[PDB]
Amino acid sequence: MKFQYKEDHPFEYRKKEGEKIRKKYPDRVPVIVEKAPKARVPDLDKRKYLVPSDLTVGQFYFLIRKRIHLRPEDALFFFVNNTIPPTSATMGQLYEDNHEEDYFLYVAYSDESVYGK
Amino acid sequence: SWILLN
C-alpha cells in the first residue's frame, strides 16, 4: 500500500508534522486519505484530514464519501494496513491501534473490497 | 493545509 504522502516526504518530516498536529489539536487524529491503486472511484484533492476522536469509523466513511461525490448506494471500501476497519470503532481507537511511527493514521479507499484489486 | 472533518 503506497501513499503519495510518504513518497513525497521523509520519515523525519512526517513525524515532526504528526507530533505538532497531535499537540495542536489533542481531540483530533491526523489521517492521510488516498485512493487505492487501480481503484474506480473519484480522487480526493486533499489527503490530510484532522478527524474528531469520538467520530465513528462509519461516520468518517460518510464524510469521505461525500467529499468524492458518491451516494451511500455506491460501492466504497476503506483500508488500514490492508484490512477494512470495524465500522463501530471510534477514529480515536483506530488511530491508537494503527497509527504509524510518524503519528499519522493512513487510510486508502477503493471501489473493491480487496486493496489493489 | 489540513481539512477539519466535522
Residue numbers in the entry:
A (entry chain A): 1 to 117
B (entry chain C): 566 to 571
Article excerpt on this structure:
EPG5 is a large-sized metazoan protein proposed to serve as a tethering factor to enforce autophagosome–lysosome/late endosome fusion specificity, and its deficiency causes a severe multisystem disorder known as Vici syndrome. We find that hEPG5 binds preferentially to members of the GABARAP subfamily of human ATG8 proteins critical to autophagosome–lysosome fusion. The hEPG5–GABARAPs interaction, which is mediated by tandem LIR motifs that exhibit differential affinities, is required for hEPG5 recruitment to mitochondria during PINK1/Parkin-dependent mitophagy. Systematic gene deletion studies of the six homologs of human ATG8 (LC3A, LC3B, LC3C, GABARAP, GABARAPL1, and GABARAPL2) revealed that the three members of the GABARAP subfamily play critical roles to autophagosome–lysosome fusion.
